[PDB]
Symmetry: D2
Subunit: 330 residues, 4 copies
């Protein structure tokens, strides 16, 4: 008997992991500049753990991530599932938490899908990207990683795609699953998993994007003192399918915003209450009678995460109570 290593496919999309600047010790850089081959060759130990094939899907900053790249990724992974043993997606950190949840809801492939990025560009002193990439490959190669949904691997930690969020603007340790914690930690190329997400993911969801050319239009409005209703009116005037509110506190709304959203809701615009507050649920049965206004409470989904689920909910139903049930199950 001979040892054979798993086959792992790297789908590259850009990010600071592929960023470069002209100095190792200045901060300035350009994103999504370096190709997948360069990233792979910067981690010569990858041969110890996997047979790696790299594909460049796009090369962008994830600040410019969009619905089309999401559809491209989901369809590619679902199509290519039988060709490989696992996937790593290199991506910008800014919207990784959004792409990861989208994929968590739409990947039907039963093989690990692991997202990874870097907070320092590839050119920087002590760049984090090479070890992050190694650890993402370790996770994608570990049989125990299966059936846990779509994962994010950053800073030696395996995080579920639903709860994971970027907590700090600059810190290499930025990614945390702030409400329910990580799934496992990586030490010396091994993972000790102690958790798995309960919410339904991947092959257990009804969302099937195989034939979609686009996704429903869902925007986000922010609340604060003296908030303008103009953003909300703009989305309503454009015929948006859904609006997510980044509420204050427990999903609360400035009154003018509340008035515009209540009206939209009774015309069939889906309205989800989420929170600008970085941890905790936007609950039912607090200060807003959701049943009365036809609103949906986001639970622990932050506004950008709630957008992901709402867009997908709107491919199935426009009924607020059915949308609320979706927000209680996925």
């Amino acid at each position: 008997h001979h040892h054979h290593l798993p086959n792992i496919t790297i789908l590259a999309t850009g990010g600071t992991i592929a960023g470069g600047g002209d100095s190792a010790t200045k901060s300035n850089y350009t994103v999504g500049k370096v190709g997948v081959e360069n990233l792979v060759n910067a981690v010569p130990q990858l041969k110890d753990i996997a047979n790696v094939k790299g594909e460049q899907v796009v090369n962008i900053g994830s600040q410019d991530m969009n619905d089309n790249v999401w559809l491209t990724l989901a369809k590619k992974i679902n199509t290519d599932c039988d060709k490989t043993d696992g996937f790593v997606i290199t991506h910008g950190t800014d919207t990784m938490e959004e792409t990861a949840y989208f994929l968590d809801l739409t990947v039907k492939c039963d093989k690990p899908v692991v997202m990874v990025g870097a907070m320092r560009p590839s050119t920087s002193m002590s760049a984090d990207g090479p070890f992050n990439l190694y650890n993402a490959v370790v996770t994608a190669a570990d049989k125990a990683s299966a059936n846990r949904g779509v994962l994010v691997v950053m800073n030696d930690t395996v995080l579920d795609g639903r709860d994971v969020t970027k907590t700090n603007t600059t810190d290499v340790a930025t990614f945390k699953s702030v409400n329910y914690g990580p799934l496992g930690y990586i030490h010396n190329g091994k993972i000790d998993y102690q958790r798995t997400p309960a919410r339904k993911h991947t092959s257990d969801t009804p969302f099937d994007v195989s034939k979609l050319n686009e996704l429903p239009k869902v925007g986000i409005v922010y609340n604060y003192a003296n908030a303008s209703d103009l953003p909300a009116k703009a989305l309503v005037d454009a015929g948006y399918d859904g609006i997510v509110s980044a509420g204050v506190g427990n999903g609360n709304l400035y009154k003018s915003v509340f008035d515009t959203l209540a009206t939209a809701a009774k015309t069939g615009t889906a309205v989800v209450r989420s929170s600008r507050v970085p941890t905790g649920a936007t609950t039912q049965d607090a200060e807003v009678d959701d049943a009365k206004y036809g609103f949906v409470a986001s639970g622990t989904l932050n506004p950008q995460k709630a957008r992901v689920l709402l867009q997908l909910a709107l491919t199935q139903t426009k009924d607020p109570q059915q949308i609320q049930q979706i927000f209680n199950q996925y």
Copy 2:
């Protein structure tokens, strides 16, 4: 001789601490031990949910504290928790009275099991009565902790421990009616700022737009079309902008709208010298000021100047 207690004024604005329905007099009467530490007088300013806080109320409060500073030894403001962090920083920048100003709220209703409001109110008075609390800026006192009004933010939607100074930490902790202060904010506040709202009846209009994958430019454009004085971007990561939002804001910054890049990310600074050439576009980087805190400072900046470089310096000093 005869022992004497400080005179503390409670300015009530509403909130769950008053659940925004119970009056200042009932709040006070419900914590009879306040008599052990101060001579409390209450005045009702408004009685609202802080999700409906607004510029008018802010102006009322700053004017009242500045006017009444001589009459009292310190102030406590009872407020909703939802926008307490905004009001705190507004007052931090506009209050000229060097005597303690302490804001407090509650996460649980006064009738709920283990309501937090009573002890929160007690400790806010302790803080307002402590001579060591002077000259530290406007404060927030919650969950046995004294927090500076610049850094303090609501971190959790329901936890009594929600309020934290997430970038630089608290100033001190309160135990047995005493505070051990170990920090003070270095940014200029109160009487060391140029902001003076004594004669203003309105504040520059400043709105906030959110960034996310596939973000619409419609919110940003709606603010521009209404002639907003300023727009704060709740950027992704280190204050980055979705392309269409970036395009709209680039235009606004050369067309009479001040533009500040902040971040939806809950901790850390939005820096210069990363991916965005702020100088080229005429944008301002917010540093550790989150979008709603950056709005506050940007409205006050626009009372002095419309020049992006002078705005950037304000954002580096206050």
Copy 3:
């Protein structure tokens, strides 16, 4: 059909939850002074949710918790399992994280066992104990709480007995599962569970204390700069069955401590390396050759938690590799 509420048994042991002082606004108080009936009557809403029966097992500060109280609790719960639908144990906060893990490893009852305490005495302004008790009863009454091991409920949060730890000396929010997160959050008397512990617990462990009169002797030594080997020598001289080291960093030992523990280990004293560092695992394959010295690495178990598992491991085996396997499974 008529609604019937679950039967819940409160086993009271003391703590600040049962503490009292002479003023509502001074900090001074005496622990474990108030009886179970008083605690129950301070939460008049408990009738809305359960039929509550209180038993006083002991009335102590949990700083004086000990092996005999642990054995008493485990045997009582296992004996009385069929008499009730769920248990709440009122307890001091100082060692709750130790009792909870002991119970997590030794309870064979398939009904929820929920531990609760209070950081402020019963006499204090804004005392946390009454709502903590309510929420513990809610958790013990929820069918979904079953099969999750022994739980700790504090500050609106349901925490697993293994990972839970006291993080702050004074804060009502002190209890966190610092490595893997909470299992669920409580809002308006309802729990949305999103996690369950993977490590084996309760009826899935081999530990059976039904007939034990005592537990193996296990002590803890602390490392720091210029550490004394005298504590370690004292435990060895007394014939201790086990010693847990609160190491520096990743389970590292001051050399004189290391020398004494290496010697003890080769005479059959079990030696577990843990860490004084509050989060993260004490790993294998770092600076200490555990295989060589016959040591066991504690993983994420902190020193007092590692003591619990080691005592129980020593009821089954004295073999270091079998003990290491136990530390990898429970």
Copy 4:
């Protein structure tokens, strides 16, 4: 004119940053960009794993910095991460040079993927070269953050982000070779302390005992039997003691041993006025000093006084 760079001295002590095997000269030569910010000179003090740090090394370091203060513009100490928090606070209390003293280490070996040591060393030099870093006490620089030597502690066994000032927060963050300081420690340090180790060759013996359910009194008794000068208790919760440990320590405190109650709990103060009457027993409460930090302060306290009340006041001031 001609631009001039500060002179910075690296004092090397070992650690994973040197993995304790590589010499100061290789460390320095591996970050050639240090030349852009300083004139670096290195000196080897020892080359050890900091799990074997000891009083002798502490005394060497304090004496060397105090002696060499005039010769340089700032210091960086390369050190293991395991006891860096102890050495930092020792130096914080004993260094009399008001010029920046910055400690640094690394969580990953220099040969590992994405090793942290190089940028950590670069930023430690930035900090040591910043004129704004003077008069803030001894510092720890890790993961782009400037932390005070009193509050800083290792929070995680392996994370590069492990070091945090868990009670009062960091002093500033480092970005693009610049620091925005927003805090400074209020406790007295360096030249405002009475501790002077210039002529000492040994320090008072102080040991640490741990509390847990069913704790043995054997460790505490072993320290007492050896005539230890002081014992720090790593208490449960708010510095509480298992009965048998409490009994032994009560006796020690009246029998020539200073006793400080600290806590195994990683954050928060061990306070007076909770369950233990410190005055009655002659114990000292540690405040926010964890057991190993309390040991440091208690050894230095015992160089001035053996009186528990004077020790308590030291613990309230430094």
